[PDB]
Structures are given as structure tokens and as C-alpha cells.
Amino acid sequence: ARETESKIYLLVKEEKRYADAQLSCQGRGGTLSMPKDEAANGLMAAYLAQAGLARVFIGINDLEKEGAFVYSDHSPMRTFNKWRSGEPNNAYDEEDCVEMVASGGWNDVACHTTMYFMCEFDKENM
Ligand SMILES: C[C@@H]1O[C@@H](O)[C@@H](O)[C@H](O)[C@@H]1O
Ligand SMILES: C[C@@H]1O[C@@H](O)[C@@H](O)[C@H](O)[C@@H]1O
Ligand SMILES: C[C@@H]1O[C@H](O)[C@@H](O)[C@H](O)[C@@H]1O
Ligand SMILES: [Ca+2]
Ligand SMILES: [Ca+2]
Ligand SMILES: [Ca+2]
């Protein structure tokens, strides 16, 4: 795991679709991880890369309104982002969920893709 002053991050090495990944994180007491700042973002990227992975699902999506991205707590995307160049490109009009790659950058992908995923937990809830 990884643990900051306020959050715990957990990499779950089970291949799931985005929605199953989110429900798994919720049942574990949290949510898909939400990189809202540089510290959290780099921490998640270092974690998945240390585990030998190329990508994981994180908690960002534009499922409800195309092009309106939100975190897994439904709060909106703010000024901070780590989109790779040209992303989010809604490729083939079917990309509504977000992967983080080992560099730390973000790419939108189809939500019916399967991959490992990262949860985040608030320590006041744990
Ligand atoms: C209360 C402390 O909180 C964070 O700073 C962590 O680095 C430690 O593991 C400890 O749990
Ligand atoms: C292989 C494809 O390459 C780019 O178009 C990305 O924007 C897509 O999401 C996908 O990764
Ligand atoms: C590792 C990265 O994964 C993403 O899905 C791709 O879109 C990028 O080109 C890159 O290969
Ligand atoms: Ca869409
Ligand atoms: Ca989209
Ligand atoms: Ca994309």
C-alpha cells in the first residue's frame, strides 16, 4: 500500500471493468483513487510502476456528460490535470473512463476495458 497523512492508496491486482473496480473500492471502504494534486498523482504513478505495471484504472470519468470529467466522488475536474498530449480524445466515441500509465499521465479509455485498479481510502473512515 501507500499511506499519506490523510489517505491510504491500495493497488488491487484483479482485472476488472471500471464499474466493477469502483464497486470493489466502495466495498473496501473507499473509492477509485482521485489524483487531485501532484503529490497524489506522482505517488499513484510510482506505486503502479514499482509493481511492474504499465497502467491501472483510476477514479476519473466522463460517463454522465460527454467531455465533462469528474472524479469518483463526482466532483468536477479542476485546473490540475495530467492528460497526455491530445487527451482526453474520446477515441471512436467510446472512451469514458481513465487509465494512469507508468509515467503518471492520464488517458481516457473504453470503460469495458479490463485492467488492475487503484483504490483510495480516507483515514478518518478507516
Ligand atoms: C500516522 C502516520 O501517517 C502518515 O504520515 C504515515 O506515513 C505513517 O504510516 C503513519 O500512519
Ligand atoms: C491506442 C489508443 O491510442 C490513442 O488514440 C488513445 O487516445 C486511445 O485511448 C488508445 O490508447
Ligand atoms: C503506455 C501508454 O498507454 C496508452 O494506453 C497509449 O495510448 C499510449 O500511446 C501509451 O502506449
Ligand atoms: Ca461518452
Ligand atoms: Ca468520453
Ligand atoms: Ca484516449
Residue numbers in the entry: 146 to 271
Per the authors:
Of particular interest is the pattern-recognition molecule collectin-11 (CL-11), whose structure resembles the better known C-type lectin mannose-binding lectin (MBL), but which differs because it is produced ubiquitously at epithelial surfaces including the respiratory tract whereas MBL is exclusively expressed in hepatocytes and the circulation. The fundamental subunit of CL-11 includes a carbohydrate-recognition domain (CRD) and a collagen-like domain (CLD). These subunits combine to form multivalent trimers and multiples of trimers with potential for cross-linking carbohydrate ligands, typically fucosylated glycans and high-mannose oligosaccharides. Upon contact with pathogen-associated or damage-associated glycan ligands, CL-11 interacts with other locally produced complement components resulting in lectin complement pathway activation.
